[PDB]
């Protein structure tokens, strides 16, 4: 149907806007702390602690399969990156501190992304 095509074009355009958002958020992690999944070879107990692991590479895989239907779903995954780190790592660690700084800086990007998603529809 033409309606299905129109919906697919909206998804494609959302995916374009989320790729730009994802790039901007990942620039706020210059140490690349959140770039890849936590390795279960290197942290073998991780899944006893963290039930839903997340990282920027995993988000990018979902994104490129057009797997985020709305900004809420994308934000859920971003929040998992931050929140998982703040639980696993103590306050006095470079990891925890990196997550706080990513959260704070990312808030700005996400605030305007929300306005753009609503505005363009």
């Amino acid at each position: 149907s033409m309606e299905q095509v129109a919906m697919e074009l909206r998804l494609t355009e959302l995916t374009r806007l989320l790729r730009s958002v994802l790039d901007q958020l990942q620039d706020k992690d210059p140490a690349r702390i959140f770039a890849q999944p936590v390795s279960l070879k290197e942290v073998p107990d991780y899944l006893d602690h963290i039930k839903h692991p997340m990282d920027f590479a995993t988000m990018r895989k979902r994104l490129e399969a057009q797997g985020y239907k709305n900004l809420h779903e994308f934000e859920e995954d971003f929040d998992l990156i931050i929140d998982n780190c703040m639980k696993y790592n103590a306050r006095d660690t470079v990891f925890y501190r990196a997550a706080v700084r990513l959260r704070d800086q990312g808030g700005v990007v996400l605030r305007q992304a929300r306005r753009e998603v609503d505005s363009i529809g």
Side-chain angles (χ1 to χ4, degrees), residues 1-2 4-6 8 11-15 17-40 42-60 62-68 70-110 112-119 121:
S1 77
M2 197 52 228
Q4 287 297 316
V5 170
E8 295 166 354
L11 176 64
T12 297
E13 284 311 295
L14 174 69
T15 304
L17 177 159
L18 300 181
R19 190 174 304 120
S20 168
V21 173
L22 186 62
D23 295 341
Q24 284 181 70
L25 294 173
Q26 191 154 19
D27 288 342
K28 310 311 181 165
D29 171 33
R32 300 192 69 86
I33 292 166
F34 305 105
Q36 295 291 332
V38 170
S39 175
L40 304 176
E42 304 171 354
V43 190
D45 71 2
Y46 190 66
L47 299 180
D48 295 344
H49 292 265
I50 299 302
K51 299 295 161 181
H52 294 100
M54 193 45 54
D55 66 271
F56 288 129
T58 303
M59 291 190 61
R60 197 172 293 279
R62 183 162 168 192
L63 182 60
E64 294 305 332
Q66 300 190 340
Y68 296 114
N70 57 51
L71 178 61
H72 182 73
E73 292 187 346
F74 176 99
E75 296 173 317
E76 289 194 334
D77 274 354
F78 179 65
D79 284 337
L80 279 175
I81 295 177
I82 298 312
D83 293 337
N84 288 346
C85 182
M86 295 172 74
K87 290 171 195 70
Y88 193 81
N89 302 110
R91 207 164 35 248
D92 69 330
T93 61
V94 63
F95 309 106
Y96 185 109
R97 289 162 176 279
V100 166
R101 293 162 59 83
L102 179 62
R103 190 197 61 185
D104 284 350
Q105 296 193 282
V108 181
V109 173
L110 286 170
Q112 197 53 37
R114 167 51 67 200
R115 295 189 67 85
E116 282 171 352
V117 172
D118 291 355
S119 189

PDB file of all heavy atoms in Angstrom, residues 57-77, unseen atoms left out:
ATOM      1  N   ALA A  57      27.679   0.615  20.378  1.00  0.00           N
ATOM      2  CA  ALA A  57      27.713  -0.239  19.189  1.00  0.00           C
ATOM      3  C   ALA A  57      26.441  -1.050  18.983  1.00  0.00           C
ATOM      4  O   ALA A  57      25.955  -1.241  17.858  1.00  0.00           O
ATOM      5  CB  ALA A  57      28.953  -1.162  19.267  1.00  0.00           C
ATOM      6  N   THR A  58      25.928  -1.589  20.082  1.00  0.00           N
ATOM      7  CA  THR A  58      24.679  -2.315  20.110  1.00  0.00           C
ATOM      8  C   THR A  58      23.530  -1.368  19.679  1.00  0.00           C
ATOM      9  O   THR A  58      22.686  -1.788  18.873  1.00  0.00           O
ATOM     10  CB  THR A  58      24.433  -2.960  21.460  1.00  0.00           C
ATOM     11  OG1 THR A  58      25.547  -3.833  21.792  1.00  0.00           O
ATOM     12  CG2 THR A  58      23.122  -3.748  21.540  1.00  0.00           C
ATOM     13  N   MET A  59      23.506  -0.116  20.160  1.00  0.00           N
ATOM     14  CA  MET A  59      22.457   0.819  19.717  1.00  0.00           C
ATOM     15  C   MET A  59      22.551   1.076  18.201  1.00  0.00           C
ATOM     16  O   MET A  59      21.538   1.156  17.481  1.00  0.00           O
ATOM     17  CB  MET A  59      22.578   2.180  20.404  1.00  0.00           C
ATOM     18  CG  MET A  59      22.235   2.139  21.899  1.00  0.00           C
ATOM     19  SD  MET A  59      22.071   3.716  22.766  1.00  0.00           S
ATOM     20  CE  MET A  59      20.743   4.453  21.890  1.00  0.00           C
ATOM     21  N   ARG A  60      23.768   1.237  17.725  1.00  0.00           N
ATOM     22  CA  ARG A  60      23.984   1.499  16.294  1.00  0.00           C
ATOM     23  C   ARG A  60      23.481   0.346  15.434  1.00  0.00           C
ATOM     24  O   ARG A  60      22.901   0.594  14.322  1.00  0.00           O
ATOM     25  CB  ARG A  60      25.433   1.853  16.063  1.00  0.00           C
ATOM     26  CG  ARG A  60      25.678   2.536  14.738  1.00  0.00           C
ATOM     27  CD  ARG A  60      27.151   3.013  14.724  1.00  0.00           C
ATOM     28  NE  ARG A  60      27.504   4.085  15.686  1.00  0.00           N
ATOM     29  CZ  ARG A  60      27.275   5.397  15.488  1.00  0.00           C
ATOM     30  NH1 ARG A  60      26.587   5.791  14.429  1.00  0.00           N
ATOM     31  NH2 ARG A  60      27.647   6.329  16.376  1.00  0.00           N
ATOM     32  N   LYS A  61      23.716  -0.886  15.865  1.00  0.00           N
ATOM     33  CA  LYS A  61      23.181  -2.081  15.152  1.00  0.00           C
ATOM     34  C   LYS A  61      21.617  -2.039  15.050  1.00  0.00           C
ATOM     35  O   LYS A  61      21.036  -2.199  13.957  1.00  0.00           O
ATOM     36  CB  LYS A  61      23.556  -3.419  15.793  1.00  0.00           C
ATOM     37  N   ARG A  62      20.983  -1.756  16.173  1.00  0.00           N
ATOM     38  CA  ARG A  62      19.521  -1.592  16.201  1.00  0.00           C
ATOM     39  C   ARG A  62      19.076  -0.437  15.291  1.00  0.00           C
ATOM     40  O   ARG A  62      18.145  -0.604  14.467  1.00  0.00           O
ATOM     41  CB  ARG A  62      19.026  -1.468  17.585  1.00  0.00           C
ATOM     42  CG  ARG A  62      17.543  -1.361  17.705  1.00  0.00           C
ATOM     43  CD  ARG A  62      17.027  -1.672  19.101  1.00  0.00           C
ATOM     44  NE  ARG A  62      15.615  -1.273  19.189  1.00  0.00           N
ATOM     45  CZ  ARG A  62      14.930  -1.196  20.309  1.00  0.00           C
ATOM     46  NH1 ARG A  62      15.533  -1.428  21.493  1.00  0.00           N
ATOM     47  NH2 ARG A  62      13.663  -0.793  20.272  1.00  0.00           N
ATOM     48  N   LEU A  63      19.761   0.686  15.373  1.00  0.00           N
ATOM     49  CA  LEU A  63      19.431   1.848  14.597  1.00  0.00           C
ATOM     50  C   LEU A  63      19.479   1.535  13.106  1.00  0.00           C
ATOM     51  O   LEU A  63      18.561   1.841  12.377  1.00  0.00           O
ATOM     52  CB  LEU A  63      20.413   2.970  14.860  1.00  0.00           C
ATOM     53  CG  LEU A  63      20.189   4.286  14.154  1.00  0.00           C
ATOM     54  CD1 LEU A  63      18.847   4.851  14.524  1.00  0.00           C
ATOM     55  CD2 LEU A  63      21.288   5.286  14.436  1.00  0.00           C
ATOM     56  N   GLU A  64      20.568   0.924  12.667  1.00  0.00           N
ATOM     57  CA  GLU A  64      20.725   0.650  11.230  1.00  0.00           C
ATOM     58  C   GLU A  64      19.781  -0.410  10.679  1.00  0.00           C
ATOM     59  O   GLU A  64      19.547  -0.447   9.485  1.00  0.00           O
ATOM     60  CB  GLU A  64      22.180   0.350  10.909  1.00  0.00           C
ATOM     61  CG  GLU A  64      23.101   1.543  11.123  1.00  0.00           C
ATOM     62  CD  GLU A  64      22.732   2.850  10.381  1.00  0.00           C
ATOM     63  OE1 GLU A  64      22.097   2.797   9.292  1.00  0.00           O
ATOM     64  OE2 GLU A  64      23.102   3.944  10.892  1.00  0.00           O
ATOM     65  N   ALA A  65      19.186  -1.244  11.525  1.00  0.00           N
ATOM     66  CA  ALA A  65      18.108  -2.098  11.141  1.00  0.00           C
ATOM     67  C   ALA A  65      16.741  -1.380  11.245  1.00  0.00           C
ATOM     68  O   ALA A  65      15.690  -2.064  11.308  1.00  0.00           O
ATOM     69  CB  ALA A  65      18.068  -3.328  12.022  1.00  0.00           C
ATOM     70  N   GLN A  66      16.764  -0.043  11.363  1.00  0.00           N
ATOM     71  CA  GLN A  66      15.521   0.747  11.673  1.00  0.00           C
ATOM     72  C   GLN A  66      14.709   0.176  12.814  1.00  0.00           C
ATOM     73  O   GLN A  66      13.452   0.095  12.789  1.00  0.00           O
ATOM     74  CB  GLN A  66      14.688   0.914  10.374  1.00  0.00           C
ATOM     75  CG  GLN A  66      15.460   1.630   9.314  1.00  0.00           C
ATOM     76  CD  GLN A  66      14.578   2.024   8.119  1.00  0.00           C
ATOM     77  OE1 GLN A  66      13.507   1.451   7.943  1.00  0.00           O
ATOM     78  NE2 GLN A  66      15.022   2.964   7.331  1.00  0.00           N
ATOM     79  N   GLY A  67      15.412  -0.213  13.896  1.00  0.00           N
ATOM     80  CA  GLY A  67      14.781  -0.861  15.008  1.00  0.00           C
ATOM     81  C   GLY A  67      14.256   0.032  16.136  1.00  0.00           C
ATOM     82  O   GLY A  67      13.688  -0.468  17.109  1.00  0.00           O
ATOM     83  N   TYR A  68      14.428   1.342  16.010  1.00  0.00           N
ATOM     84  CA  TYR A  68      13.768   2.269  16.954  1.00  0.00           C
ATOM     85  C   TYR A  68      12.516   2.923  16.260  1.00  0.00           C
ATOM     86  O   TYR A  68      12.679   3.747  15.374  1.00  0.00           O
ATOM     87  CB  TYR A  68      14.740   3.362  17.411  1.00  0.00           C
ATOM     88  CG  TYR A  68      15.940   2.821  18.203  1.00  0.00           C
ATOM     89  CD1 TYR A  68      17.251   2.883  17.723  1.00  0.00           C
ATOM     90  CD2 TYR A  68      15.756   2.305  19.447  1.00  0.00           C
ATOM     91  CE1 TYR A  68      18.328   2.386  18.487  1.00  0.00           C
ATOM     92  CE2 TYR A  68      16.851   1.771  20.210  1.00  0.00           C
ATOM     93  CZ  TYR A  68      18.106   1.812  19.709  1.00  0.00           C
ATOM     94  OH  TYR A  68      19.145   1.284  20.462  1.00  0.00           O
ATOM     95  N   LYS A  69      11.351   2.623  16.792  1.00  0.00           N
ATOM     96  CA  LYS A  69      10.062   3.146  16.203  1.00  0.00           C
ATOM     97  C   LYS A  69       9.767   4.580  16.622  1.00  0.00           C
ATOM     98  O   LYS A  69       8.991   5.271  15.969  1.00  0.00           O
ATOM     99  CB  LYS A  69       8.871   2.275  16.654  1.00  0.00           C
ATOM    100  N   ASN A  70      10.347   5.025  17.740  1.00  0.00           N
ATOM    101  CA  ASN A  70      10.092   6.354  18.282  1.00  0.00           C
ATOM    102  C   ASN A  70      11.314   6.795  19.135  1.00  0.00           C
ATOM    103  O   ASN A  70      12.191   5.949  19.409  1.00  0.00           O
ATOM    104  CB  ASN A  70       8.794   6.359  19.075  1.00  0.00           C
ATOM    105  CG  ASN A  70       8.749   5.345  20.209  1.00  0.00           C
ATOM    106  OD1 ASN A  70       9.655   5.269  21.045  1.00  0.00           O
ATOM    107  ND2 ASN A  70       7.692   4.537  20.236  1.00  0.00           N
ATOM    108  N   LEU A  71      11.377   8.075  19.499  1.00  0.00           N
ATOM    109  CA  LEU A  71      12.514   8.585  20.298  1.00  0.00           C
ATOM    110  C   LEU A  71      12.546   7.943  21.695  1.00  0.00           C
ATOM    111  O   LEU A  71      13.649   7.711  22.230  1.00  0.00           O
ATOM    112  CB  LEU A  71      12.451  10.095  20.442  1.00  0.00           C
ATOM    113  CG  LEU A  71      13.510  10.777  21.272  1.00  0.00           C
ATOM    114  CD1 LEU A  71      14.909  10.553  20.713  1.00  0.00           C
ATOM    115  CD2 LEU A  71      13.220  12.267  21.407  1.00  0.00           C
ATOM    116  N   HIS A  72      11.399   7.659  22.283  1.00  0.00           N
ATOM    117  CA  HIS A  72      11.319   6.997  23.616  1.00  0.00           C
ATOM    118  C   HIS A  72      12.144   5.701  23.666  1.00  0.00           C
ATOM    119  O   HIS A  72      12.908   5.466  24.616  1.00  0.00           O
ATOM    120  CB  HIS A  72       9.862   6.770  24.086  1.00  0.00           C
ATOM    121  CG  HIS A  72       9.751   6.144  25.433  1.00  0.00           C
ATOM    122  ND1 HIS A  72      10.035   6.838  26.591  1.00  0.00           N
ATOM    123  CD2 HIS A  72       9.468   4.876  25.811  1.00  0.00           C
ATOM    124  CE1 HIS A  72       9.927   6.025  27.625  1.00  0.00           C
ATOM    125  NE2 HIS A  72       9.571   4.829  27.180  1.00  0.00           N
ATOM    126  N   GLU A  73      11.980   4.865  22.656  1.00  0.00           N
ATOM    127  CA  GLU A  73      12.735   3.581  22.610  1.00  0.00           C
ATOM    128  C   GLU A  73      14.266   3.808  22.594  1.00  0.00           C
ATOM    129  O   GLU A  73      15.017   3.053  23.200  1.00  0.00           O
ATOM    130  CB  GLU A  73      12.332   2.748  21.409  1.00  0.00           C
ATOM    131  CG  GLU A  73      10.900   2.217  21.491  1.00  0.00           C
ATOM    132  CD  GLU A  73      10.530   1.241  20.363  1.00  0.00           C
ATOM    133  OE1 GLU A  73      11.254   1.166  19.375  1.00  0.00           O
ATOM    134  OE2 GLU A  73       9.484   0.531  20.483  1.00  0.00           O
ATOM    135  N   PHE A  74      14.712   4.780  21.816  1.00  0.00           N
ATOM    136  CA  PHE A  74      16.108   5.154  21.690  1.00  0.00           C
ATOM    137  C   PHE A  74      16.598   5.689  23.042  1.00  0.00           C
ATOM    138  O   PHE A  74      17.637   5.284  23.552  1.00  0.00           O
ATOM    139  CB  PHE A  74      16.276   6.152  20.561  1.00  0.00           C
ATOM    140  CG  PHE A  74      17.652   6.702  20.371  1.00  0.00           C
ATOM    141  CD1 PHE A  74      18.481   6.199  19.429  1.00  0.00           C
ATOM    142  CD2 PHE A  74      18.076   7.809  21.129  1.00  0.00           C
ATOM    143  CE1 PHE A  74      19.740   6.764  19.174  1.00  0.00           C
ATOM    144  CE2 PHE A  74      19.348   8.343  20.936  1.00  0.00           C
ATOM    145  CZ  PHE A  74      20.195   7.791  19.993  1.00  0.00           C
ATOM    146  N   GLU A  75      15.854   6.611  23.608  1.00  0.00           N
ATOM    147  CA  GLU A  75      16.218   7.106  24.963  1.00  0.00           C
ATOM    148  C   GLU A  75      16.290   6.025  26.035  1.00  0.00           C
ATOM    149  O   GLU A  75      17.180   6.102  26.935  1.00  0.00           O
ATOM    150  CB  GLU A  75      15.278   8.206  25.466  1.00  0.00           C
ATOM    151  CG  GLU A  75      15.324   9.455  24.657  1.00  0.00           C
ATOM    152  CD  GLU A  75      14.239  10.431  25.108  1.00  0.00           C
ATOM    153  OE1 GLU A  75      13.061  10.021  25.353  1.00  0.00           O
ATOM    154  OE2 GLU A  75      14.562  11.577  25.175  1.00  0.00           O
ATOM    155  N   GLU A  76      15.418   5.032  25.982  1.00  0.00           N
ATOM    156  CA  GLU A  76      15.479   3.906  26.925  1.00  0.00           C
ATOM    157  C   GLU A  76      16.853   3.211  26.924  1.00  0.00           C
ATOM    158  O   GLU A  76      17.447   2.972  28.038  1.00  0.00           O
ATOM    159  CB  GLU A  76      14.374   2.871  26.671  1.00  0.00           C
ATOM    160  CG  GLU A  76      12.965   3.306  27.035  1.00  0.00           C
ATOM    161  CD  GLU A  76      11.988   2.144  27.087  1.00  0.00           C
ATOM    162  OE1 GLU A  76      12.201   1.105  26.416  1.00  0.00           O
ATOM    163  OE2 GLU A  76      11.040   2.274  27.883  1.00  0.00           O
ATOM    164  N   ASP A  77      17.334   2.944  25.715  1.00  0.00           N
ATOM    165  CA  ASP A  77      18.641   2.291  25.496  1.00  0.00           C
ATOM    166  C   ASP A  77      19.747   3.243  25.956  1.00  0.00           C
ATOM    167  O   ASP A  77      20.679   2.780  26.638  1.00  0.00           O
ATOM    168  CB  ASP A  77      18.863   1.827  24.046  1.00  0.00           C
ATOM    169  CG  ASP A  77      18.292   0.440  23.770  1.00  0.00           C
ATOM    170  OD1 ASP A  77      17.810  -0.232  24.717  1.00  0.00           O
ATOM    171  OD2 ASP A  77      18.404   0.014  22.593  1.00  0.00           O
TER     172      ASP A  77
END
